[PDB]
A = this chain, B = another copy of it.
């Protein structure tokens, strides 16, 4: 559903996510941002706060600060809106409760049951990955981010 938006809207989403990721990665702030595409994620949602806001780098940075009520769980972006924050899913990979690898596992789970793209920033290393269909594209150079993410969002869907 990203592919159906005007080029201005797509470019906005990518740039805002870019600024957010630059901050989060540099300061080693964990985050899970999931862009839903054609498979609607609402069916698989366990918990989560619905905020239905415009997507914005500053709001994202606020959401994922350690002292924030919304920094655990996943943000779900639908078209150009942050629909949910602190979202969890009943996928069968995020059933471990071990902290290490938790967001990577949650992202993998989501990617296995939907065509969604999921950016993950690691609280430990600040490393950034783009998770899609059980693959982890590791973004070692953040100045490739906008390009990589764009390709991911325009790939073949379900």
Q: Which residues of A contact B (CB under 8 A)?
A: 49-54, 56, 58-59, 61-63, 65-71, 82, 85-86
Query: B residues within 8 A CB of A71?
Result: 62
Decide if A69 touches B63 in the complex (CB within 8 Å). no
| Cross-chain contact B69 with A85 (CB below 8 angstroms) | no
B residues within 8 A CB of A65? Answer: 62, 65, 67-68
- This chain's copy number in the assembly: 2
B69 touches A67 (CB 8 A): no
Main secondary structure of the interface of A (DSSP, over half): mixed
Closest to A53 in B: B53
Rounded to whole angstroms, the CA-CA distance of A66 and B66 in the bound complex is 11
Leading 7 A-B pairs by shortest Cβ distance: A53-B53, A62-B68, A58-B69, A51-B53, A65-B67, A52-B54, A62-B62
- Kindly list 18 other residue pairs between chains A and B, CB separation below 8 angstroms, not including A51-B54, A65-B68: A49-B56, A49-B58, A50-B56, A52-B54, A53-B59, A58-B70, A58-B85, A58-B86, A59-B63, A59-B85, A62-B63, A62-B65, A62-B68, A62-B71, A65-B65, A66-B67, A67-B67, A68-B68
